[PDB]
Amino acid sequence: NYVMAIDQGTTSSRAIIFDRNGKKIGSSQKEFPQYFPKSGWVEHNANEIWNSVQSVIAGAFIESGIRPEAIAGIGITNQRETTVVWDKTTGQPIANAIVWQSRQSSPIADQLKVDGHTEMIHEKTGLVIDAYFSATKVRWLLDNIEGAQEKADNGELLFGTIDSWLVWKLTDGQVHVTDYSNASRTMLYNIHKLEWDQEILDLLNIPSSMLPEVKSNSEVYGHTRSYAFYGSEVPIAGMAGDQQAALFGQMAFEKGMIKNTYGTGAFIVMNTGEEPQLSDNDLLTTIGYGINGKVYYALEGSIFVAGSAIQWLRDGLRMIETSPQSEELAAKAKGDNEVYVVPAFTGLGAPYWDSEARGAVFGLTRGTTKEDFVRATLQAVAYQSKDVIDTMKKDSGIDIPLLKVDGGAAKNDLLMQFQADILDIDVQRAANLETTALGAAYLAGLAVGFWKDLDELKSMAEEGQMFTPEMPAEERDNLYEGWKQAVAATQTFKF
Amino acid sequence: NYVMAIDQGTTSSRAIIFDRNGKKIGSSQKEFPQYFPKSGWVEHNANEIWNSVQSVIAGAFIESGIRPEAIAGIGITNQRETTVVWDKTTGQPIANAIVWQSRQSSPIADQLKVDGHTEMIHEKTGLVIDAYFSATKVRWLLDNIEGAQEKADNGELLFGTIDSWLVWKLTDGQVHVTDYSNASRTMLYNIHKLEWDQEILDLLNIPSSMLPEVKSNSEVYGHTRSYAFYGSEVPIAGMAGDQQAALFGQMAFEKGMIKNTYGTGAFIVMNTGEEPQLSDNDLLTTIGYGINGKVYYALEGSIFVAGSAIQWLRDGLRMIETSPQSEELAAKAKGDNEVYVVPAFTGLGAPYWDSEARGAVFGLTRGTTKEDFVRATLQAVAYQSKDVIDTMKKDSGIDIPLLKVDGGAAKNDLLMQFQADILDIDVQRAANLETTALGAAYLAGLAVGFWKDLDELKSMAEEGQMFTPEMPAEERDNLYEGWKQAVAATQTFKF
Incomplete structure (x- = not known):
């Protein structure tokens, strides 16, 4: 059973x-x-x-x-x-x-x-x-x-x-x-x-x-x-x-389908069907999974430090009491959104692959608050996910109108709405944020014939929450532009 | 009396x-x-x-x-x-x-x-x-x-x-x-x-x-x-x-005598005698004082935000409960001194005069602690003061062997030893850090014959302490290199 x-x-x-x-x-x-x-x-x-x-x-x-x-x-x-x-x-x-x-x-x-x-x-x-x-x-x-x-x-x-x-x-x-x-x-x-x-x-x-x-x-x-x-x-x-x-x-089984998981790191993975797609020094070409005598390849962008930046706020700076507090603080930020945190502690992952980059912060003024600082720290993941997803658009030729999302940190509604606004693409969050574990269960259950097929489709499909982009192009563009500037400056600190 | x-x-x-x-x-x-x-x-x-x-x-x-x-x-x-x-x-x-x-x-x-x-x-x-x-x-x-x-x-x-x-x-x-x-x-x-x-x-x-x-x-x-x-x-x-x-x-009455006051900002001022020195567009030529019929000129480098960075910690990030607490936190840092805080909230002062730069932080890792972050924020003023004092030895051909210091924040013995260490210059420290209020009283007291002359000398000079450079060249040069990188990178974030 x-x-x-x-x-x-x-x-x-x-x-x-x-x-x-x-x-x-x-x-x-x-x-x-x-x-x-x-x-x-x-x-x-x-x-x-x-x-x-x-x-x-x-x-x-x-x-x-x-x-x-x-x-x-x-x-x-x-x-x-x-x-x-x-x-x-x-x-x-x-x-x-x-x-x-x-x-x-x-x-x-x-x-x-x-x-x-x-x-x-x-x-x-x-x-x-x-x-x-x-x-x-x-x-x-x-x-x-x-x-x-x-x-x-x-x-x-x-x-x-x-x-x-x-x-x-x-x-x-x-x-x-x-x-x-x-x-x-x-x-x-x-x-x-x-x-x-x-x-x-x-x-x-x-x-x-x-x-x-x-x-x-x-x-x-x-x-x-x-x-x-x-x-x-x-x-x-x-x-x-x-x-x-x-x-x-x-259920991202068809070519083009893409998800992001928001957890300790964040990992954008797009199914590229039964053939692998070319690289650059930017995305990884990887194996999605092998089932039914077929192998599906995937393109991936890796963002090593995502929720562990929050843990740093908690443990390193002791700026926050617990990790859930980040969402409350950040909801209360009053700044113009001109502070950027690039929490690349271990190097920048995709599409930069720069091992020598370290974490950095930009746009600080005397008015910057704890709240502004925490919010900037959260939004880094959504900005770098854009870096990734735009690269995948270029590398795939595949226009992308839907990002599916999961992972413990995808629970933050404002973050998910920012992610959609910044990307200008819809973001659908799974009902059960542990689709990682569900995906393993589905694989096990198909093998032993507990489920007969992939088209025991979205038979089960409880999930919903849709975040639809509502930020004008002007705001979205200025935000992302400051991010890119922050990343370029982070890359020039090579001590 | x-x-x-x-x-x-x-x-x-x-x-x-x-x-x-x-x-x-x-x-x-x-x-x-x-x-x-x-x-x-x-x-x-x-x-x-x-x-x-x-x-x-x-x-x-x-x-x-x-x-x-x-x-x-x-x-x-x-x-x-x-x-x-x-x-x-x-x-x-x-x-x-x-x-x-x-x-x-x-x-x-x-x-x-x-x-x-x-x-x-x-x-x-x-x-x-x-x-x-x-x-x-x-x-x-x-x-x-x-x-x-x-x-x-x-x-x-x-x-x-x-x-x-x-x-x-x-x-x-x-x-x-x-x-x-x-x-x-x-x-x-x-x-x-x-x-x-x-x-x-x-x-x-x-x-x-x-x-x-x-x-x-x-x-x-x-x-x-x-x-x-x-x-x-x-x-x-x-x-x-x-x-x-x-x-x-x-009592920096003679050409070449130089002090730094560590206060809200920090301001290095060297007496240049009765002629101005040529300034760069990188230092200010200013008036030191007019007394006894003469006008003494000064060279100055202004660092707008020094101790006000520490009030930002307290009031903006609420990282410290009180400003004095900064000293305690930094004393306790165990990181290898690779984080840099360039707290230029309102632009960079001397030698940069970059009004567009804003505060930035670099070299952060998962192991960065509150204490390291505080310590980097304190050391900023010592690094910039070396930018300034090196500029001054450069514009005026003359080694500087002794910097006198005063101001509230010079009470920090570790920041003063660090200051001397990274300069490779002896740092004195006044007995009363209100040498500002003392210099004013001197000026008023000479004028009403309360004291008769400047050589009612060092008669009263009630003082010293002394901080001798004791950091090897290799260490000072690497510390400083990383500081110039951090400022070069801060000046690249021009969003």
């Missing part, structure tokens, strides 16, 4: 039990520790990630009353790029996972750019050389953890993005698999030919004995053998990197 | 009684209202300024026990540029005073540059065309206050900077005067020929009937006829703009 989704996020994990109608019948959420050993580094402990996941599985069962034997399948979805390396026999990570947020491995990406590898790597993976992606993280771990390169060389070490790490734990070590969307983010996988790339692996000295089998996004990978499911061998049947799962949960 | 100095500053006034040894016997200080009717305007009510001054005169008398008949002369010192225009017969300001801080008349200053007068004004006044100075504020009041141009044309209105206003009020309207230093700030006075400049008055259609008589900085201007001094015709005998009063108070 139900499908469980596990959504293993950057700051928290969640498990959600959905029924045949696509409705939430049970759920549990648990934060886990974030580690910053040096500025610019972000790590997680993959065991503490795994316990967070055990906790929410058990929690969703405990609170709902539902037991494992009622679950038709499990979908898994996850913060992408984040890299685990673990000993195959003891199942222990050789060190902390390194988060997609981290830039600890940036020297290794810099050297790759120095040695001339840009276009080769972009033509195989669709990606920009950067420490965002898993390849340099696996190289970092092989360079810096004593003994590890030799073990990997001896076949004793496994690599996994978090999806892979989860299925391995959930099967108690039986299955080492990743799906095409997560593999496409490692910068080790050739997204054209659909295989791990030997040349990139030899170049970074990564033995291929580390690597999981890659499979589609909707098939039974294996069955649980695990405490919180115990005794049921529940099929693990749906897997996608979170931003692709969101793309899926949006 | 005693001298009183009145220091009418930007946010408060103060009155100090000093004995013949220069010691403080009594003081009183009192804030008065600040008005900001539009973003970038700053105004005072001149009547409120006058009541704040009667208030602090009375308080110094009440708290010291000294009485007006025991006061040998009065010195007067004031926020400069700040412009008051009044009716000679009612005594009433035609409108709010317009503060040196405001830029409301900046369209007037732009049109003067457009019309090609920059070199003419600079040659005559030593100054850069800007709405910082009194000239465009008078023109603004004559543009904007109904009927005032015709009254001024009819000889019915008087202009004065705040020294001139307080002497008018203290003598019950019998004396309309200003000293060389304050008049040098108006951009209406020719500091070479030592007269009001007729060509500049015609250009700005300001009638000479508005203008006070311009006199030396140490002579009997008149006598009080006023409540707080009632029954004593107390000699009013010393007057300088607050910053030239600081230079005097510090």
Whole structure:
């Protein structure tokens, strides 16, 4: 009667039990520790990630009353790029996972750019050389953890993005698999030919004995053998990197269809059908998902720092008491809107890909208030999303009249209205802001035949909220122009 | 037996009684209202300024026990540029005073540059065309206050900077005067020929009937006829703009001696002897003081926003509860000193004179704390003061080995050591940070023979402390590099 989704996020994990109608019948959420050993580094402990996941599985069962034997399948979805390396026999990570947020491995990406590898790597993976992606993280771990390169060389070490790490734990070590969307983010996988790339692996000295089998996004990978499911061998049947799962949960199945998820980072992903579309040094060409013997590619713009800028306001400046306070403060801003925050703490993501940029603020006067400051900080995401979406218009030739939206931070009505005004395009927000987890559930539920099809269409389609652009061209243009100026000035600070 | 100095500053006034040894016997200080009717305007009510001054005169008398008949002369010192225009017969300001801080008349200053007068004004006044100075504020009041141009044309209105206003009020309207230093700030006075400049008055259609008589900085201007001094015709005998009063108070009497006052703004002033130095269009050539028949000139770099950045923290961001708290927060910063705050809310002052720049922040990361942000905001003034002092050693061939410092904010020992460190120059620090009020009292006391001469020397020089540069070249150069980047980037945001 139900499908469980596990959504293993950057700051928290969640498990959600959905029924045949696509409705939430049970759920549990648990934060886990974030580690910053040096500025610019972000790590997680993959065991503490795994316990967070055990906790929410058990929690969703405990609170709902539902037991494992009622679950038709499990979908898994996850913060992408984040890299685990673990000993195959003891199942222990050789060190902390390194988060997609981290830039600890940036020297290794810099050297790759120095040695001339840009276009080769972009033509195989669709990606920009950067420490965002898993390849340099696996190289970092092989360079810096004593003994590890030799073990990997001896076949004793496994690599996994978090999806892979989860299925391995959930099967108690039986299955080492990743799906095409997560593999496409490692910068080790050739997204054209659909295989791990030997040349990139030899170049970074990564033995291929580390690597999981890659499979589609909707098939039974294996069955649980695990405490919180115990005794049921529940099929693990749906897997996608979170931003692709969101793309899926949006039903963005046709070429051109685009969503943005507003969370710790924000990720604009457009389905480009069964063929990949050309790059530049601006968007990423990536894999949406593989299902029904077909692979759908996607174009993506990545905005690394979005809701985590709010967390900085809370934690770093202590300007706000909690993160929900940002929305109240910002609603109360009285300034002309001439302050701009460009919270690019770790570098600017799409369409700039400038790793050396850091966060900056512009247009401050003696009248600037806490409220003005918080609002500017929120609006950065909507402006950079425009940067992205206009680039995708240019790169796609595809005019875009509808942006679908989801993610915890999409709950802010004024932000969503600003986003539509600034874009001059309609913005439709999902009823259930966790379409990430729904997308994983849909993939799992199709695999095990809980749902027969994609055209069990928007059968289920509860969702609505439409934000229609109501800002005149003049205002919208002056706003965006100040943003572009702020970004160009941010880029000139290269100390 | 005693001298009183009145220091009418930007946010408060103060009155100090000093004995013949220069010691403080009594003081009183009192804030008065600040008005900001539009973003970038700053105004005072001149009547409120006058009541704040009667208030602090009375308080110094009440708290010291000294009485007006025991006061040998009065010195007067004031926020400069700040412009008051009044009716000679009612005594009433035609409108709010317009503060040196405001830029409301900046369209007037732009049109003067457009019309090609920059070199003419600079040659005559030593100054850069800007709405910082009194000239465009008078023109603004004559543009904007109904009927005032015709009254001024009819000889019915008087202009004065705040020294001139307080002497008018203290003598019950019998004396309309200003000293060389304050008049040098108006951009209406020719500091070479030592007269009001007729060509500049015609250009700005300001009638000479508005203008006070311009006199030396140490002579009997008149006598009080006023409540707080009632029954004593107390000699009013010393007057300088607050910053030239600081230079005097510090005994920087010789060519090359230089001070910095850390106050609301920060203003570095070097005595250039009896000739001017050549300025760049990057420093101001101004009058330091006229005494003993001679006129001493000065070079100055003005930094508009220094301690007012810290009031912005308090009142705009509410990042700090009180201004003093800044010191504590910054002392506690653990970041690597890579955040820069360029708090140029009203434009950049010297050496930039960029009226379009606004406040900006750079180098922010997830680890930036309140304490780092506060510390960067405090260090701005030290970095800009080095821009200025380097410019000055550049325009005048001469190493500067010692900067004397005063002002409220020089009480911050860490900011002073940082100041010395990044300069590689010794920094002294006056024993009494009210060297402004001291320099005024000196000027009044020389004039009435209370002290006989300048070489009643350093006789009284009661003082030092000392901050010796102790940061290596590598560290200072990197700190500074990052500051020049941040300002270059701030000047690129020209939205």
